[PDB]
Amino acid sequence: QIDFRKKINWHRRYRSPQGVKTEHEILRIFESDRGRIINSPAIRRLQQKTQVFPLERNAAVRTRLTHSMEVQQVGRYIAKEILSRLKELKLLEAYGLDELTGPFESIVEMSCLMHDIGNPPFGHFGEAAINDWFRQRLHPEDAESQPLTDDRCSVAALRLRDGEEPLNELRRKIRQDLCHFEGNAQGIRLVHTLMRMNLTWAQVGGILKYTRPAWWRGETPETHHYLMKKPGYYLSEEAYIARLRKELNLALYSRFPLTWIMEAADDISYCVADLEDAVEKRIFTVEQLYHHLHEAWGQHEKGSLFSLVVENAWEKSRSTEDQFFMYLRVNTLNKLVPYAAQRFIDNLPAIFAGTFNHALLEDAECSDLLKLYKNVAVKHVFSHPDVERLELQGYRVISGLLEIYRPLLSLSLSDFTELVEKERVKRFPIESRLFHKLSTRHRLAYVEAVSKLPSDSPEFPLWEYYYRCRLLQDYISGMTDLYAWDEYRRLMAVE
Amino acid sequence: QIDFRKKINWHRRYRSPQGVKTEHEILRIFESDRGRIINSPAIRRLQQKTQVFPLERNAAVRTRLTHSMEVQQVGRYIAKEILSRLKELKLLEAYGLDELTGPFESIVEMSCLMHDIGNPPFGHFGEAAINDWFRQRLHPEDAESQPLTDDRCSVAALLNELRRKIRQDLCHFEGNAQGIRLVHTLMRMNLTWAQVGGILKYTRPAWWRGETPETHHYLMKKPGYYLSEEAYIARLRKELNLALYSRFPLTWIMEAADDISYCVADLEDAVEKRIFTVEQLYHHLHEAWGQHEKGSLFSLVVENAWEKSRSTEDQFFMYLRVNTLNKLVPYAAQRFIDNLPAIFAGTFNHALLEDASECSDLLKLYKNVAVKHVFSHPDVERLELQGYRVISGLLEIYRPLLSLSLSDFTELVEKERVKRFPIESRLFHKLSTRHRLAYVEAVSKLPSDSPEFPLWEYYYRCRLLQDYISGMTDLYAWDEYRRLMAVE
Ligand SMILES: [Mn+2]
Ligand SMILES: [Mn+2]
């Protein structure tokens, strides 16, 4: 049975409010969350994180922030559409929404905003350089089966010991979790353990995009593959994630019903904006682009969504660029938003369950239009040398930075712990200074996770390392494209 | 009589919608406006326009954009508060709001967002360098009375009343006035009248020469619009039911949010730039209050937030922000409702937080601390001075286009390639196509025959230049300065 009272959890993890609360009181909690998000430095960082194009000396181009604001307004429209349609169906009171109208909407907007929140400096390329650097040092493939006589792992504790141990399973999970860094998973890690925001369960639900644990190694459940497409959370969050499922009434590997709305907007905004920027960076004319889109459609009919959207917007522009993109955007939303709004309502039971193994804008006419934009963007924009140059640049910056911090990892627990207590250590001065370079928040978080472990435990050293790596990963992922590059040069000694 | 149906004008200037429209249809028009604003490049430019502190290699510091988002959430709260209070008073249906709930709120947020949108690269300092550069070339003081035997104006053409108005308008550039110019004539957004009302902060015309309006002193504190907009501005007044020099009732809400967000954010950034500790700051605030009582708003806000803190800094600012809004927002929400007739009239000669209000005092306290410690910092001041030269120098680089005859200038507008003026050609190409387009359009609307026609051309010519510059980000203007000075 569909009841949103049960999904829109206004309680918190720590210092949580409890007992009754009016429609207004509840609105205020959700409005509190907005203020928390909007004033966050993690949200400010996004104006300095690159979105497709390099951070040029004129802000004409979209950054991760300006894009996420655009995504949020799309999300607002979809949510608002779902609501209006449902009030016309009178199912609003029936689904326990008549009083959670505003909250619903705000959650969407705020999750929209926070997509890309945990992404590393150089995005998907950052992810690569991180995962790759860890892979050459851990080799999680060497953990999959029985203890290999020749384990490629550089860490003594994480190397599968031959002797009959269930500790071998702990090593397996750590190796896969650290080598499978994902922005969404880092986003969850960020809002809770790092940024220490203390948001409503419902909000944190909306930013939980995937249900796959980072430590996952096998084949994906056939009836869960879509939902477990990448990883959604780390081993460090597993505890809190369980807490989240129970609070939001979610089964293992079940998604929060609103996440689907936020996802949709992101999928829409996704290309069109970069395509606008492409003509702005003079890659081709607006006319040239129209012809690339005509070429891309192929199977042309005079009543298709191409004619209704792209052909339509092209005619509006002639008796230019502004008008073109302005109406192209309009045209798209005006057809796509209703579709996804409907799709949501249509498949609401499975969505409420968070079991629905599909996207609002599927694969089989809306999905086609999007794909068309994507193809054009791939073949002409994403392929541009200045883009690719920066993509490759990013990779080295992160890889090199990770190597600069290798000495802290290439250490014994006894030594590392020593550095954590005494800030000034005799024999390890480089390591000292390098550890000071780390941000006070990720540093704090490490210690806290460590102090919660049992000293006596044989798993304790493995955990320390898992956390040690997490700590390093947090520092790096936390950086902006600029800061990471600047630091790379500074630590390579060229400034 | 108070009816918001009459103030929340969902019609547009060009391609305007008309006839009935449902609550939903109306919401959609206001939601359309949001999309227009949010996708605007003029709104993107703000992530590259400096807010107090220089850009820095880490975005830990607020930019004009990140501040305006903060302002918008404050505005949201105030608007939402006014509404909730009014629903409790049941006056919502009574004031024609029961169906314009969402719109009201969106307008606030969108106007909040668009405050500073018309600000130049080096904001306040940019204004100076512009106005100063024009003043040495026009001397509008020399126009005030009778034609001076020794007129300091560099322009032959600068009917005596038209000359007066042009000189004052061009020499009195203001971000808010430029903002109005921007959304309509430059950005060609075509927004709902109501939205454009919300960004009209001042009722003073830029061409005004005759110190202080007595009865309308506060509303005409700074200029609100240019001579180039006077026509459209008249159109706006009539559409929004405003008397000459009357303000849009919602503008007051947006304004308030800005007055609040104004300092606290830079104070957070001050501790972030290590200017002083969070502890050092608390002591500067204790020093600043002086007249200490154990139940005052200082104790309730600052003392309160200080105790909560004992990350420390995060918690401190987080709850300090909370504490402030939790007391100030209700006040301004009330003030609005309390003085609603005069606000609806847009005649109310005061601010929501203004009088001897404990609220106004708290704000002033933040401001004083910011002035005495943050705004006074050398790296700030250095950049402020730097900005001035960049703009002044840039204005001088473009002096050749102004130091020209109409006959010559016009020639350059038709033929892109002109023989004798090659520097001027290339310099004119440097200007953005939008401001270029806008100039021509304003010019083509004038009567060729008219004796005022040459004066207008110049007014517009200067406006065109001003648009280019004001349109730039701190970075682009600096980059260009160096590029045109030949150091890259
Ligand atoms: Mn996105
Ligand atoms: Mn401001």
Which of A74, A107, A419 is CA-nearest to residue A272?
A74
Tell me how crowded residue A493 is: count the other CB atoms within 10 A of its CB: 6
Residue with tokens 């200045």: A386
Task: Nearest by CB to B59, from A31, A47, A440: name it.
Answer: A47
Structure method: X-ray
- Region of B52 please: left (phi>0), alpha (psi -120 to 50) or beta: left
Which of B423, B92, B129, B75 is CA-nearest to residue B251?
B75
Q: Looking at the DSSP assignment, which residues form a beta bridge with residue B50? A: B63
Tell me how crowded residue A452 is: count the other CB atoms within 10 A of its CB: 9
What gap in Å lies between CA B355 and CA A90, rounded to an integer? 48
Tokens of B104: 């009201």
Q: How many alpha carbons fall within 13 Å on the CB side of residue A1?
A: 5
At A238, the amino acid letter reads E
Binary contact (B24, A77; C-beta < 8 A): no
Provide the 8-state DSSP code for A53.
B
Is the distance from CB of A294 to CB of A313 less than 8 angstroms? no
Which of B129, B49, B155 is CA-nearest to residue B393?
B129
> For residue A72, how far is its CA from the centre of ligand 1 (angstroms)?
10
What gap in Å lies between CA A474 and CA A466, rounded to an integer? 12
What gap in Å lies between CA B19 and CA A388, rounded to an integer? 52
The vertex-A235 CA angle with A233 and A238, nearest 5°, equals: 70
What gap in Å lies between CA A129 and CA A175, rounded to an integer? 16
Helix (H) or strand (E) holding B223: strand B223-225
Tell me how crowded residue B93 is: count the other CB atoms within 10 A of its CB: 11
Helix (H) or strand (E) holding B69: helix B64-88
Task: Nearest by CB to B58, from A77, A326, A483: name it.
Answer: A483
Chain breaks after residues in chain A, where C lies over 2.5 Å from next N: 319, 364
Residue with tokens 């996004």: A46
Ligand nearest to the CA of A269: 1
Reported structure resolution in angstroms: 3.1
Query: Which phi and psi angles does B382 have, rounded to 5°?
Result: -60, -55
Which of A29, A57, A81, A441 should one mutate to test binding to chain B, selecting the residue with the greatest count of B CBs within 10 A?
Answer: A57
At A220 the three-state DSSP class reads coil
Is the distance from CB of B179 to CB of B200 less than 8 angstroms? no
Is the distance from CB of B111 to CB of B199 less than 8 angstroms? yes
Binary contact (A61, B46; C-beta < 8 A): no
What gap in Å lies between CA A93 and CA A153, rounded to an integer? 57
CA distances from A108 to A202, A331, A383 (A): 10, 22, 32
Q: Got the DSSP string for A422-454?
A: -SS-SS-HHHHHHHHHS-HHHHHHHHHHHHTS-
Residue A274 annotated in active site:
no
Comparing alpha-carbon positions, the chain A residue that sits nearest to B30 is A77
Which of A72, A70, A12 is CA-nearest to residue A273?
A70
Which of A26, A51, A58, A443 should one mutate to test binding to chain B, selecting the residue with the greatest count of B CBs within 10 A?
Answer: A58
Comparing alpha-carbon positions, the chain A residue that sits nearest to B39 is A70
Residue with tokens 């040092």: A137
At B225, the amino acid letter reads Y
| B contacts of A194 (beta carbons < 8 Å) | none
Is the distance from CB of B400 to CB of B376 less than 8 angstroms? no
Task: Nearest by CB to A70, from B38, B77, B314: name it.
Answer: B38
Query: Which phi and psi angles does A244 have, rounded to 5°?
Result: -65, -45
Binary contact (A61, B44; C-beta < 8 A): yes
Cα distance between the two ends of chain A: 63
Residues 6+ apart with CB under 8 A from B172: B131, B140, B206, B207, B208, B223
Query: Which phi and psi angles does B223 have, rounded to 5°?
Result: -80, 145
Residue with tokens 């326009």: B49
Is the distance from CB of A122 to CB of A392 less than 8 angstroms? no
Binary contact (A58, B475; C-beta < 8 A): yes
Catalytic residue among A15, A57, A318, A433: A433
Q: How many pairs of residues across A and B have Cβ atoms under 8 Å apart?
A: 98
Count of helices and strands (H, E) across chain B: 24, 2
Q: Looking at the DSSP assignment, which residues form a beta bridge with residue A51? A: A53
> For residue B64, how far is its CA from the centre of ligand 2 (angstroms)?
8
Binary contact (B70, A38; C-beta < 8 A): yes
Residue A115 annotated in active site:
yes
Binary contact (A39, B80; C-beta < 8 A): no
Task: Nearest by CB to B321, from A39, A44, A73: name it.
Answer: A39
CA distances from B119 to A48, A70, B64, B206, B459 (A): 21, 22, 10, 15, 20
Crossing angle for the helix pair B378-397 and B474-485, to the nearest 10 degrees: 60
Helix (H) or strand (E) holding B77: helix B64-88
Rg (alpha carbons) of chain B, rounded to whole number: 24
Is the distance from CB of B249 to CB of B346 less than 8 angstroms? yes
What gap in Å lies between CA B385 and CA B383, rounded to an integer? 5
Ligand nearest to the CA of A273: 1
Query: Which phi and psi angles does A51 have, rounded to 5°?
Result: -125, 100
Which of B184, B269, B291, B296 is CA-nearest to residue B234?
B184
Residues 6+ apart with CB under 8 A from B51: B61, B62, B63, B64, B66, B67, B266
The whole-angstrom distance between A190's CA and the closest CA on chain B is 14
What gap in Å lies between CA A470 and CA A475, rounded to an integer? 9
Helix (H) or strand (E) holding B180: helix B175-181
What gap in Å lies between CA B10 and CA B18, rounded to an integer? 9
Is the distance from CB of B224 to CB of B180 less than 8 angstroms? yes
Ligand nearest to the CA of B261: 2
Alpha-carbon dihedral of residues B115, B119, B122, B123, nearest 10 degrees? Answer: -60
| A contacts of B76 (beta carbons < 8 Å) | 31, 34
Binary contact (A48, B59; C-beta < 8 A): yes
Residues 6+ apart with CB under 8 A from B177: B118, B202, B206, B223, B224, B225, B226, B229
> For residue B131, how far is its CA from the centre of ligand 1 (angstroms)?
42
What gap in Å lies between CA B157 and CA B458, rounded to an integer? 9
Comparing alpha-carbon positions, the chain B residue that sits nearest to A443 is B311
> For residue B116, how far is its CA from the centre of ligand 2 (angstroms)?
6
Comparing alpha-carbon positions, the chain A residue that sits nearest to B42 is A60
What gap in Å lies between CA A355 and CA A373, rounded to an integer? 29
Binary contact (A59, B69; C-beta < 8 A): no
What gap in Å lies between CA B195 and CA A428, rounded to an integer? 62
Tokens of B230: 């006077």
- Considering all CA atoms of chain B, what is the largest pairwise distance in Å, rounded to the nearest integer? 77
Query: Which phi and psi angles does A96 have, rounded to 5°?
Result: 60, 45
> For residue B371, how far is its CA from the centre of ligand 2 (angstroms)?
15
Binary contact (B39, A329; C-beta < 8 A): yes
Is the distance from CB of A404 to CB of A491 less than 8 angstroms? yes
Residue with tokens 């600096």: B478
Query: Which phi and psi angles does B347 have, rounded to 5°?
Result: -110, -25
Helix (H) or strand (E) holding B225: strand B223-225
Residue with tokens 């970069």: A274
Based on the number of CB atoms within 10 Å of its own CB, is B414 exposed (0-12), middle (13-18) or buried (19 or more)?
Answer: exposed
What gap in Å lies between CA B157 and CA B159, rounded to an integer? 10
Comparing alpha-carbon positions, the chain B residue that sits nearest to A41 is B60
> For residue A314, how far is its CA from the centre of ligand 1 (angstroms)?
25
Report the DSSP pairing between strands B204-205 and B223-225: parallel
Query: Which phi and psi angles does A169 have, rounded to 5°?
Result: -70, -35
Tell me how crowded residue A308 is: count the other CB atoms within 10 A of its CB: 16
> For residue A218, how far is its CA from the centre of ligand 1 (angstroms)?
28
Helix (H) or strand (E) holding A25: helix A23-38
Q: Got the DSSP string for A125-141?
A: HHHHHHHHHHHHHH-GG
Which of B131, B341, B343, B129 is CA-nearest to residue B222?
B131
Q: Looking at the DSSP assignment, which residues form a beta bridge with residue B223? A: B204
Is the distance from CB of B200 to CB of B246 less than 8 angstroms? no
CA distances from A339 to A4, A81, A343, A362, A443 (A): 22, 10, 6, 10, 46
What gap in Å lies between CA B62 and CA B49, rounded to an integer? 10
Provide the 8-state DSSP code for B294.
T
CA distances from A4 to A104, A200, A284, A348, B372 (A): 9, 15, 48, 11, 52
| Domains along chain B with CATH numbers | 1-119+172-247 (1.10.3210.10), 120-171+375-488 (no CATH), 248-374 (no CATH)
Catalytic residue positions of B, numbered: 67, 115-116, 258, 426
| Share of chain A residues as helix, strand and coil, in percent rounded to the nearest 5 | 60, 0, 35
Is the distance from CB of A94 to CB of A351 less than 8 angstroms? no
Is the distance from CB of B395 to CB of B129 less than 8 angstroms? yes
What gap in Å lies between CA A391 and CA A484, rounded to an integer? 14
Binary contact (B475, A44; C-beta < 8 A): no
Comparing alpha-carbon positions, the chain B residue that sits nearest to A48 is B59
Tokens of B379: 């790296």
Tokens of B99: 């169906």
What gap in Å lies between CA A314 and CA A308, rounded to an integer? 10
Which of A484, A458, A480 is CA-nearest to residue A43?
A480
Tokens of B33: 């406006």
Q: Looking at the DSSP assignment, which residues form a beta bridge with residue B51? A: B53
Provide the 8-state DSSP code for B147.
-
Task: Nearest by CB to A441, from B34, B311, B472: name it.
Answer: B311
Is the distance from CB of A122 to CB of A272 less than 8 angstroms? no
Residues 6+ apart with CB under 8 A from B404: B421, B424
Provide the 8-state DSSP code for B215.
G
